[PDB]
Amino acid sequence: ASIRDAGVADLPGILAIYNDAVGNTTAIWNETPVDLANRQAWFDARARQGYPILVASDAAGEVLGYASYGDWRPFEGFRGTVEHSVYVRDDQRGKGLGVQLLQALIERARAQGLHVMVAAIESGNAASIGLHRRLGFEISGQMPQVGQKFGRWLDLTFMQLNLDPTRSAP
Amino acid sequence: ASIRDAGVADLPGILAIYNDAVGNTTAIWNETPVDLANRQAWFDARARQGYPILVASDAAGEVLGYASYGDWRPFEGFRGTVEHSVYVRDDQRGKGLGVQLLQALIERARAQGLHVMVAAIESGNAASIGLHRRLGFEISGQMPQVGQKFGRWLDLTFMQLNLDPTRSAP
Numbered sequence: 001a002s003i004r005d006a007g008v009a010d011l012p013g014i015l016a017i018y019n020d021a022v023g024n025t026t027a028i029w030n031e032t033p034v035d036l037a038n039r040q041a042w043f044d045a046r047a048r049q050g051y052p053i054l055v056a057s058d059a060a061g062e063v064l065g066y067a068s069y070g071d072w073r074p075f076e077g078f079r080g081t082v083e084h085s086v087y088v089r090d091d092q093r094g095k096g097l098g099v100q101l102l103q104a105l106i107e108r109a110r111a112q113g114l115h116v117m118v119a120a121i122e123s124g125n126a127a128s129i130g131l132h133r134r135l136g137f138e139i140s141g142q143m144p145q146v147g148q149k150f151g152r153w154l155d156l157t158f159m160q161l162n163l164d165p166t167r168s169a170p
Numbered sequence: 171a172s173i174r175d176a177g178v179a180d181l182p183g184i185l186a187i188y189n190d191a192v193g194n195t196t197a198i199w200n201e202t203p204v205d206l207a208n209r210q211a212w213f214d215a216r217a218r219q220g221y222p223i224l225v226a227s228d229a230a231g232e233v234l235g236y237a238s239y240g241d242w243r244p245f246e247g248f249r250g251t252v253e254h255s256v257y258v259r260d261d262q263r264g265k266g267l268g269v270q271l272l273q274a275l276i277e278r279a280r281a282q283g284l285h286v287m288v289a290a291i292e293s294g295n296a297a298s299i300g301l302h303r304r305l306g307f308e309i310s311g312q313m314p315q316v317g318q319k320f321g322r323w324l325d326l327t328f329m330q331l332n333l334d335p336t337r338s339a340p
């Protein structure tokens with residue numbers, strides 16, 4: 001697969017992947033599916049902030065997965081920190097697309113001069129925790145029963161990657 | 171001091187405390203002061219969500235401190251979790267107002283049917299972390315350099331309290 005910036009034509013594929021995660025996994029703690037308009041607004045909001053939306057695609061242009069990041073917490077002081085998301089279409093798992101997407105995202109974040117990338121992962125998702133660990137992320141939090149989905153409590157694991165360790169001051 | 175729900179007449183007092191924290195402390199990671207309208211909007215927004223705003227007041231009716239809570243993360247799955255804030259006027263420290271406000275806030279949260287209360291504390295605030303530890307809060311996050319203020323990086327500590335540990339499922 002090849003990694004590139006998402007275009008409007010990729011939204012339908014992104015939408016399908018997102019809604020599949022919503023209905024079948026704990027990767028996203030939302031149970032209500034969204035529509036195209038919702039993802040179009042999201043697409044525009046990201047462009048407005050200069051934040052990237054990447055997609056793993058093939059020669060045909062099918063969306064095999066996507067990744068992006070946005071603000072983490074609503075306070076001026078967290079401006080050097082973003083929370084990202086990586087979604088691989090179910091049938092494309094086990095092919096390293098997650099690694100390709102996250103590596104590309106890390107490079108864009110660093111190029112944008114950001115300082116820290118935060119990952120919010122459901123604690124039982126060993127596959128995701130491992131992917132992040134091998135890309136430099138370190139566990140920074142374990143928060144039990146802070147979430148819920150499918151009628152059960154869920155635990156959240158926080159991980160983070162410092163994009164510029166030598167930058168001792170903002 | 172007595173603890174009661176805030177009213178519109180308490181906003182100027184709350185505004186002063188908030189803005190003083192903005193300019194002189196690392197309790198809130200914002201460096202821009204707000205105006206009364208901002209607080210009035212916040213006041214009405216909390217009421218709409220059924221979230222309380224409590225004030226510690228004296229015989230003269232002065233706001234010696236205030237506390238409240240709101241959503242922690244923007245996803246449906248976190249609806250059982252709230253993030254709180256507690257501010258004591260700077261001349262009223264050492265008078266147990268923080269404990270008084272937090273204990274009252276905890277009871278309100280439990281009564282509203284919430285599952286977890288989260289505190290977001292600058293890691294160097296030993297006093298605040300100790301106060302929360304004594305109220306049953308446990309450390310669940312330690313994130314280096316995710317914030318900044320006064321031209322330096324700041325570390326964030328997350329602490330949490332399960333309000334109803336016997337509730338097996340949401």
Ligand SMILES: C[S@](=N)(=O)CC[C@H](N)C(=O)O
Nearest residue numbers: 027028029084085120245
């Ligand atoms: C919904 S969740 N388990 O907190 C994951 C959120 C995802 N990283 C996002 O930024 O949309």
Ligand SMILES: C[S@](=N)(=O)CC[C@H](N)C(=O)O
Nearest residue numbers: 075197198199254255290
């Ligand atoms: C700005 S901060 N250090 O993340 C504290 C935020 C505070 N708990 C609040 O809810 O507004």
